[PDB]
């Protein structure tokens, strides 16, 4: 349940929105 079930919770802003500047995904 790290996936994105929960992910969302630790999102940092949203879900993609700038998950590309640094870290990239780290939900992997």
């Given amino acids: ?3 994105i ?3 969302h919770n630790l999102f940092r ?3 993609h929105r ?3 500047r640094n870290f990239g ?3 992997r």
């Fill in 1 to 3: 349940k790290y996936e």
């Fill in 5 to 7: 079930t929960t992910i």
């Fill in 13 to 15: 802003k949203l879900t």
């Fill in 18 to 20: 700038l998950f590309r």
């Fill in 25 to 27: 995904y780290t939900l």
